[PDB]
Amino acid sequence: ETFRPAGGDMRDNWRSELYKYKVVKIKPLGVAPTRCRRRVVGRRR
């Protein structure tokens, strides 16, 4: 097989540098089971 140079889409120039990056959104709220109730109790106290 033979290869030739291409330069049509500038996005490849940008992909060439950005490949090692990705952006995420942080999700600070979290919910989980626990032996802690509300009002007048946190398991006998």
């Binding site: 942080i26 919910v31 989980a32 802690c36 109730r37």
Partner: protein, 154 residues
């Protein structure tokens, strides 16, 4: 396990760590929600008035404003939520809502000593908003009970 001063610098530092260990780092994740990642060795002057021309309408100008407002837009949602769950100003808030095995039937240690939060949140991925709805439904059934109490209370 690192020091109290490093904990402050380690945003998402207990990401691959076990859920129980992540609790020392709750504040540091919270602070990022508005101010981004913390800066140590250098702390420049972040005051107002740095736009001295018509640069507020440019590409970056608009982009920055969008990023600035979105950042608080989102922060409030998380707060307002905690608020109508009755967990305002709490990084760890106990509720009245009992846990459901259908949501998950893991013991304490099966979770807290075995799972990472993102790992666990992926397990609870399905049942989350429904819980969010119970959390809020609880809060109301509380507020109802208070007015109930104010009626008998002369």
């Amino acid at each position: 396990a690192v020091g109290m001063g490093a904990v402050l610098l380690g945003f998402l530092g207990a990401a691959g760590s076990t859920m129980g260990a992540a609790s020392i780092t709750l504040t540091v994740q919270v602070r990022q929600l508005l101010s981004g990642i913390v800066q140590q060795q250098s702390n420049l002057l972040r005051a107002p008035e740095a736009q001295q021309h018509l640069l507020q309408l440019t590409v970056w100008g608009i982009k920055q404003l969008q990023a600035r407002v979105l950042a608080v837009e989102r922060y409030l949602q998380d707060q307002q939520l905690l608020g109508i769950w009755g967990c305002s100003g709490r990084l760890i808030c106990c509720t009245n809502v009992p846990w459901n095995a259908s949501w998950s039937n893991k013991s304490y240690s099966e979770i807290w000593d075995n799972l990472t939060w993102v790992e666990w949140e992926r397990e609870i991925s399905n049942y989350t908003q429904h819980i969010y709805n119970l959390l809020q439904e609880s809060q109301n059934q509380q507020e109802k009970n208070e007015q109930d109490l104010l009626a008998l209370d002369k």
